[PDB]
């Protein structure tokens, strides 16, 4: 049925991009369909199944955003407040002028993409933040950033008086029922941990690193992510504060050309062209500063949009698309880092094929 539309697109996708295995969740009002394809590990041939864990990379950022938003709903975190209010060890730095909202929208003054090599632990990280000088106007320019969302994770953890991972597990993952979601894959589940393949056909698995948890560290199943997506689409029953936290992550905060930056989530008004989506996932959007105009009539969550987030590691590639107006969402996880253009095309074809959008 749904599988009739889905399966040939995935097969062609996996053949065209030589992806060993995929896990796919389609969320709709009527229920969720989970599909697994191919091998969790090319060398061993172990099949992808209900238990297979995939590195989701920057998809992790949506959880980080969600926890941040929940701290805000509980009144423990103020989004427009200076970051140094919750992290006094940054008092007197640029983070007297940068808010948690800036960090969640990548408008923190040009805070760079990658954690620098000199930063090896928490203490060298906080020293790096104290000394860093903005290179872009705060709140007026977007630079996609691991350091920024990372800091939002640390700001959030302080505001909740807890450690990031257990606090995420207790306040977001457990209540969403996301029990196959891990930051550090336990020894007992290593057999379910899919092996990544890089662009050269080589086995690869993500290494620990500074701010890994906050920015890119999650290993999970497609079904678990579908639960986050379910909740975003108002198709789950969750704690009222959690739902409100989740809803607030889709508030539009900045216009960035054709893209609206919400809280980590990025969105486009419908109808959207695939080329517009592709431009969102390209060099010009991801790897350059883009002018960003604040929406302070803070836009209420919209029901006429394409909401998405890509996430990758060296050996993994993931994509989440939500269409709130159609109560429809799509999660695609692969143990290959294949081009974002191809993720976009496959998503669009799936959703168009399902009748959830129209091509012209
Ligand atoms: Ca405020
Ligand atoms: Ca490095
Ligand atoms: Ca860590
Ligand atoms: Ca094509
Ligand atoms: Cs768990």
XYZ file of C-alpha atoms and ligand atoms in Angstrom:
365
model
C 0.000 0.000 0.000
C 2.208 2.768 1.380
C 4.907 0.148 0.796
C 3.938 0.054 -2.892
C 4.873 3.737 -3.261
C 7.819 3.555 -0.882
C 9.673 0.372 -1.793
C 10.621 1.015 -5.406
C 11.859 4.550 -4.590
C 14.053 3.201 -1.776
C 15.346 0.334 -3.927
C 16.286 2.723 -6.702
C 17.792 5.148 -4.182
C 19.860 2.422 -2.527
C 21.053 1.131 -5.900
C 21.844 4.611 -7.274
C 23.784 5.625 -4.125
C 25.072 2.172 -3.128
C 23.615 2.375 0.386
C 24.047 -0.896 2.334
C 20.942 -0.462 4.472
C 18.161 1.897 5.385
C 15.498 2.307 8.008
C 12.479 4.364 7.099
C 9.560 5.591 9.141
C 6.475 7.015 7.594
C 4.228 8.746 10.116
C 0.597 9.483 9.158
C -2.775 9.894 10.835
C -3.792 6.212 10.698
C -0.520 5.001 12.062
C 3.163 4.678 11.437
C 4.828 2.371 8.934
C 8.374 1.230 9.619
C 10.449 -0.314 6.847
C 13.919 -1.819 6.835
C 16.049 -2.501 3.780
C 19.350 -4.237 3.163
C 22.247 -4.750 5.489
C 23.177 -3.062 8.795
C 26.782 -3.920 7.972
C 27.974 -4.485 4.409
C 30.854 -6.784 5.374
C 28.851 -9.087 7.677
C 25.555 -8.833 5.794
C 23.561 -8.643 9.034
C 20.096 -7.337 8.016
C 18.647 -4.017 9.113
C 15.793 -4.726 11.570
C 13.655 -3.213 14.334
C 16.722 -3.027 16.617
C 19.350 -1.628 14.220
C 20.933 1.574 15.583
C 21.993 4.301 13.120
C 24.227 7.314 13.776
C 21.924 10.278 13.051
C 24.531 13.016 13.310
C 23.134 16.550 13.338
C 19.604 15.119 13.531
C 20.637 14.976 17.180
C 20.294 18.767 17.263
C 16.473 18.501 17.176
C 16.514 16.646 20.531
C 18.882 19.263 21.863
C 16.484 21.950 20.725
C 13.559 20.078 22.281
C 15.220 19.812 25.721
C 16.101 23.508 25.546
C 12.521 24.332 24.714
C 11.250 22.222 27.629
C 13.549 24.066 30.042
C 11.959 27.215 28.717
C 8.418 25.936 29.210
C 9.331 24.931 32.791
C 10.480 28.541 33.327
C 14.043 27.515 34.116
C 15.493 28.901 30.859
C 14.800 32.250 29.205
C 15.550 32.086 25.462
C 16.352 35.751 24.826
C 18.374 36.022 28.038
C 22.149 36.231 27.744
C 23.844 32.825 27.829
C 26.206 34.027 30.635
C 23.175 34.252 32.951
C 23.110 30.455 33.101
C 26.831 29.988 32.630
C 28.567 32.616 34.851
C 31.942 31.221 33.799
C 31.275 33.024 30.473
C 30.341 36.313 32.200
C 32.185 39.192 30.571
C 32.545 37.419 27.202
C 30.523 37.716 23.939
C 27.910 35.501 25.593
C 26.686 38.489 27.588
C 25.199 39.549 24.197
C 24.226 36.122 22.708
C 21.039 34.385 23.779
C 19.991 30.718 23.832
C 17.594 31.592 20.993
C 20.549 32.816 18.910
C 22.312 29.522 19.572
C 19.267 27.508 18.586
C 18.875 29.469 15.350
C 22.577 29.665 14.473
C 22.543 33.465 14.791
C 25.200 33.632 17.529
C 27.556 36.127 15.864
C 29.196 33.790 13.435
C 30.082 31.137 15.988
C 32.009 28.680 13.747
C 30.940 25.296 12.411
C 33.379 22.918 13.984
C 34.881 22.574 17.442
C 38.500 23.719 17.007
C 41.406 21.273 17.425
C 42.825 23.177 20.457
C 39.602 22.420 22.372
C 39.934 18.938 23.878
C 37.643 18.962 26.907
C 35.092 21.066 28.806
C 37.648 23.414 30.349
C 39.507 24.205 27.135
C 36.016 24.686 25.539
C 34.880 27.274 28.091
C 38.240 29.064 27.698
C 37.732 29.123 23.921
C 34.219 30.621 24.344
C 35.459 33.290 26.799
C 38.073 34.511 24.305
C 36.133 34.176 20.987
C 35.119 37.388 19.201
C 31.983 37.514 17.020
C 32.597 37.869 13.284
C 28.998 38.541 12.300
C 26.232 40.743 13.640
C 24.415 38.904 16.407
C 20.851 38.069 15.459
C 21.314 39.255 11.878
C 23.390 36.484 10.275
C 23.131 32.697 10.141
C 26.105 30.377 10.315
C 25.241 26.698 10.817
C 27.149 25.711 13.992
C 28.052 22.769 16.168
C 29.638 25.079 18.739
C 26.430 27.036 19.023
C 23.973 24.188 19.500
C 26.605 22.602 21.685
C 26.554 25.641 23.918
C 22.759 25.625 23.946
C 22.993 22.075 25.249
C 25.436 23.217 28.048
C 23.272 26.297 28.790
C 20.209 24.050 28.996
C 21.881 21.471 31.222
C 22.942 24.239 33.674
C 19.455 25.750 33.647
C 18.034 22.310 34.627
C 20.744 21.526 37.266
C 21.526 18.230 35.591
C 23.983 16.476 33.299
C 22.973 16.681 29.616
C 22.575 12.961 28.739
C 20.620 11.771 31.786
C 18.524 14.920 31.720
C 17.729 14.392 28.018
C 16.867 10.726 28.780
C 14.586 11.505 31.723
C 12.818 14.645 30.432
C 12.510 13.954 26.640
C 13.504 10.442 25.490
C 11.711 8.408 28.236
C 8.419 10.325 28.045
C 8.428 10.084 24.212
C 8.991 6.377 24.642
C 12.296 6.570 22.808
C 13.986 3.588 24.463
C 16.294 2.555 21.574
C 17.949 6.015 21.545
C 21.552 6.183 22.743
C 24.435 8.608 23.132
C 26.858 5.855 23.993
C 25.772 2.503 22.611
C 25.831 0.017 25.553
C 28.002 -3.071 25.109
C 24.860 -5.244 25.054
C 23.648 -3.500 21.889
C 26.882 -3.339 19.842
C 25.575 -6.193 17.668
C 22.716 -3.877 16.640
C 24.978 -0.954 15.870
C 25.032 -0.571 12.090
C 28.385 0.008 10.489
C 28.723 3.172 8.436
C 30.106 3.377 4.923
C 31.883 6.525 3.717
C 31.851 8.012 0.192
C 34.792 5.735 -0.802
C 32.978 2.507 0.169
C 35.000 2.184 3.404
C 33.712 1.115 6.858
C 33.594 3.977 9.362
C 32.112 4.655 12.787
C 31.880 8.003 14.616
C 34.514 8.851 17.246
C 33.785 10.572 20.566
C 34.528 14.290 20.589
C 33.859 17.540 22.343
C 30.162 18.448 22.393
C 29.363 15.220 20.562
C 26.212 14.562 22.592
C 24.791 18.020 22.137
C 25.533 18.328 18.413
C 25.779 14.965 16.692
C 26.135 11.985 18.987
C 22.835 10.102 18.886
C 22.510 6.498 17.733
C 18.882 5.476 17.312
C 16.255 3.679 15.272
C 13.888 5.076 12.690
C 11.003 4.059 14.927
C 12.319 6.116 17.847
C 12.684 9.250 15.722
C 9.187 8.621 14.388
C 7.976 9.194 17.961
C 9.513 12.617 18.043
C 7.976 13.240 14.630
C 4.597 11.832 15.823
C 4.612 14.293 18.708
C 5.536 17.202 16.446
C 2.506 16.295 14.289
C 0.135 16.137 17.317
C -0.348 12.407 16.767
C 1.030 11.312 20.121
C -0.241 11.632 23.634
C 2.363 13.299 25.784
C 2.688 15.449 28.863
C 1.161 18.896 28.123
C 4.407 20.744 28.924
C 6.371 18.396 26.650
C 3.900 18.929 23.817
C 4.176 22.688 24.280
C 7.974 22.412 24.311
C 7.880 20.362 21.099
C 5.462 22.778 19.441
C 7.708 25.751 20.260
C 10.594 24.154 18.377
C 8.649 24.809 15.168
C 8.205 28.500 15.840
C 9.694 30.527 12.967
C 12.416 32.786 14.325
C 14.361 34.065 11.345
C 13.801 34.583 7.636
C 16.898 33.355 5.779
C 16.175 33.909 2.100
C 13.527 31.306 1.207
C 14.177 29.333 4.419
C 12.634 30.010 7.820
C 14.870 29.079 10.688
C 12.871 27.655 13.584
C 14.495 26.051 16.640
C 16.986 23.853 14.812
C 14.159 22.864 12.449
C 14.287 24.569 9.079
C 11.197 25.166 7.052
C 9.703 26.306 3.778
C 6.257 27.538 2.840
C 4.213 25.347 0.536
C 4.226 24.791 -2.277
C 7.984 24.314 -2.285
C 10.195 23.396 -5.214
C 12.801 20.641 -4.732
C 15.487 23.085 -6.041
C 14.648 25.392 -3.110
C 15.004 22.447 -0.756
C 18.341 21.489 -2.408
C 19.656 25.034 -2.028
C 18.895 24.722 1.725
C 21.186 21.687 1.890
C 24.043 23.115 -0.153
C 27.357 24.888 0.215
C 25.825 28.390 0.091
C 23.407 27.800 2.973
C 25.439 25.425 5.155
C 28.999 26.766 4.692
C 28.542 30.524 4.300
C 27.057 33.212 6.530
C 23.523 34.074 5.393
C 21.695 37.287 6.203
C 18.969 36.562 8.775
C 15.972 38.769 9.619
C 14.343 38.243 12.991
C 10.650 37.415 13.184
C 9.484 38.964 16.455
C 6.088 38.692 15.901
C 7.522 35.227 16.719
C 5.741 33.115 14.128
C 3.316 30.583 15.604
C 3.902 27.020 14.301
C 2.589 26.801 10.739
C 0.452 24.132 9.072
C 1.344 25.023 5.462
C 5.052 24.216 5.513
C 7.742 21.671 4.719
C 9.788 21.173 7.887
C 13.131 19.368 7.701
C 16.535 18.551 9.046
C 19.423 16.633 7.534
C 21.991 14.875 9.612
C 25.156 13.047 8.701
C 28.310 11.455 10.047
C 31.247 10.200 7.893
C 29.386 6.957 7.367
C 25.751 7.875 7.893
C 23.074 10.034 6.309
C 19.660 10.856 7.744
C 16.732 13.032 6.776
C 13.516 14.036 8.533
C 10.684 15.772 6.719
C 7.430 16.920 8.345
C 4.281 18.263 6.724
C 2.171 19.512 9.695
C -0.839 20.420 7.497
C -1.069 16.779 6.317
C -0.174 15.309 9.691
C 2.540 13.449 7.751
C 6.211 12.896 8.454
C 9.108 10.947 7.047
C 12.304 9.626 8.619
C 15.028 8.158 6.372
C 18.174 6.702 7.918
C 21.029 5.184 5.974
C 24.393 3.732 6.873
C 25.968 5.681 4.059
C 26.681 9.433 3.813
C 24.993 10.001 0.450
C 24.296 13.452 -1.059
C 21.679 15.708 0.488
C 20.259 16.320 -3.010
C 19.399 12.642 -3.222
C 17.745 12.631 0.239
C 15.648 15.608 -0.817
C 14.674 14.013 -4.101
C 13.782 10.697 -2.489
C 11.718 12.416 0.241
C 9.848 14.572 -2.252
C 9.107 11.566 -4.506
C 7.891 9.542 -1.507
C 5.649 12.278 -0.209
C 4.363 13.249 -3.654
C 3.770 9.544 -4.426
C 1.781 9.326 -1.172
C -0.344 12.245 -2.290
C 0.935 14.459 0.546
C 2.259 17.140 -1.875
C 1.873 18.006 -5.614
C 4.816 18.413 -8.059
C 3.889 21.280 -10.469
Ca 12.763 36.897 27.914
Ca 39.062 18.877 14.471
Ca 30.254 13.739 25.520
Ca 16.517 13.078 -10.379
Cs 17.811 3.844 26.242
